[PDB]
Amino acid sequence: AEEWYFGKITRRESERLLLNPENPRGTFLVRESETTKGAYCLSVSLNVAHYKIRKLDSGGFYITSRTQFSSLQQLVAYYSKHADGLCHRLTNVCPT
């Protein structure tokens, strides 16, 4: 649950790590958002896309309202099976 979580890393640095030529499409990491407090961000790779992971006041997370999760790990497991709206399916955890 920690592997793909890079925490407080900048958007610029997440793009720099994801854009490594060794990383296949679908390489990703989850991080804290720099513009929206309380929310996270899923960065996936070749270009990088950034998705805001919003948090409901009751608890859960979601990128789009039609697909909600109890946690970041439930969100990651879901998009690792189907991109379902994302640019690509989550395939690889970004190397440190």
Binding site: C41, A49, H50, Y51, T64, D84, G85, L86
Partner: peptide, 8 residues
């Protein structure tokens, strides 16, 4: 600049 949105 911005973020990608899952299409509606």
């Amino acid at each position: 600049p911005q973020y990608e949105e899952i299409p509606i």
